[PDB]
Amino acid sequence: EETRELQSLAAAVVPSAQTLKITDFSFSDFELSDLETALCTIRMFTDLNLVQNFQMKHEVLCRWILSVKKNYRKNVAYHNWRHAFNTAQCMFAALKAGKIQNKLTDLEILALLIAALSHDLDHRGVNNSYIQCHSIMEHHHFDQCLMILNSPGNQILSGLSIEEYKTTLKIIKQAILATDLALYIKRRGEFFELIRKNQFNLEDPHQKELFLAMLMTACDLSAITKPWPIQQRIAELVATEFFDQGEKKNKIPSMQVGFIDAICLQLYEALTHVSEDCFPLLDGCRKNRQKWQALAEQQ
Numbered sequence: 001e002e003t004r005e006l007q008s009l010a011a012a013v014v015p016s017a018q019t020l021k022i023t024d025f026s027f028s029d030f031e032l033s034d035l036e037t038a039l040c041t042i043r044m045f046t047d048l049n050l051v052q053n054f055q056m057k058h059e060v061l062c063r064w065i066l067s068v069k070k071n072y073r074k075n076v077a078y079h080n081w082r083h084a085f086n087t088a089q090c091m092f093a094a095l096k097a098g099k100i101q102n103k104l105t106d107l108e109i110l111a112l113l114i115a116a117l118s119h120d121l122d123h124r125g126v127n128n129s130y131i132q133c134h135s136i137m138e139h140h141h142f143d144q145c146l147m148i149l150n151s152p153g154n155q156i157l158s159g160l161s162i163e164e165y166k167t168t169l170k171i172i173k174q175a176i177l178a179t180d181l182a183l184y185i186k187r188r189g190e191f192f193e194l195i196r197k198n199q200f201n202l203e204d205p206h207q208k209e210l211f212l213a214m215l216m217t218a219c220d221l222s223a224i225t226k227p228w229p230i231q232q233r234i235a236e237l238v239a240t241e242f243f244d245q246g247e248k249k250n251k252i253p254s255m256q257v258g259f260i261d262a263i264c265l266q267l268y269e270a271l272t273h274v275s276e277d278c279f280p281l282l283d284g285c286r287k288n289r290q291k292w293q294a295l296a297e298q299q
């Protein structure tokens with residue numbers, strides 16, 4: 001039963017962030033059970049002071065994490081719980097190892113972590129896009145997020161005041177909507193020009209919101225930064241979703257270089273200017289570009 005999964009999770013000991021390796025940008029989840037990802041997720045909340053500062057009951061958080069996990073589709077090859085889990089893991093690593101934690105409020109951190117885990121809820125697959133611009137899919141991901149956040153027993157934000165709740169919901173909404181790459185493509189120019197001119201200032205509310213959005217995209221796409229054998233396997237999953245609805249290997253390397261140049265490099269370059277300790281994401285992205293390019297030239 002589902003409630004048997006909850007007992008095991010609620011009862012278990014949550015090992016530290018160091019043991020779980022969740023502070024490392026190089027993190028991988030291929031060796032982890034579903035239960036183990038749920039533990040790493042508890043430790044993320046815990047070591048960001050979110051359980052303390054917003055008074056989350058253990059039983060509620062556990063049930064919430066499991067509800068979230070249930071609302072991804074495992075038959076979808078890439079856009080599933082593991083991608084969401086990894087996205088949140090990258091957010092955690094960017095906050096701790098990347099030293100972004102200090103540049104944000106606790107409400108912003110809570111919203112990003114929840115948004116990261118929720119940002120692709122009930123995704124059907126890039127191909128399976130039959131419904132019934134304005135970023136329609138991300139609106140549905142947020143609706144799912146909200147539906148779970150309001151479910152009996154899953155209300156991890158009950159400890160917030162009414163004002164804190166509405167702010168956090170606003171930030172969560174913005175953050176999930178930022179994972180539409182069309183919005184990323186539309187807003188990134190400003191971010192890059194504000195970093196190029198040395199005019200970047202997080203005290204400005206508009207520039208904070210813009211940064212929260214760019215951070216979300218950095219985490220969402222961070223599989224492109226992983227060590228080569230991890231990257232290859234995650235590329236393989238993406239390909240299974242893009243093709244097989246669940247000669248081929250000729251074109252893949254060139255596309256990966258195309259995607260890195262078009263979307264990824266500038267973002268990770270920009271993020272590194274904001275905080276130098278996020279360099280490993282840029283570095284890992286460059287190393288993967290080198291490797292795909294070598295394959296693209298017929299190695």
Ligand SMILES: O=c1c2c(F)cccc2oc2c(Cc3ccc4c(c3)OCO4)[nH]c(-c3nccs3)c12
Pocket residue numbers: 181221222223224231234235238239240242243252255256259
């Ligand atoms: O995460 C993405 C990705 C995305 F998020 C949103 C939109 C497009 C994307 O394309 C991606 C490629 C390029 C690509 C495009 C089409 C393909 C393909 C590879 O293989 C088969 O068909 N690589 C990755 C990753 N690779 C590693 C981690 S993320 C992709």
Ligand SMILES: [Mg+2]
Pocket residue numbers: 119120179180
């Ligand atoms: Mg998405």
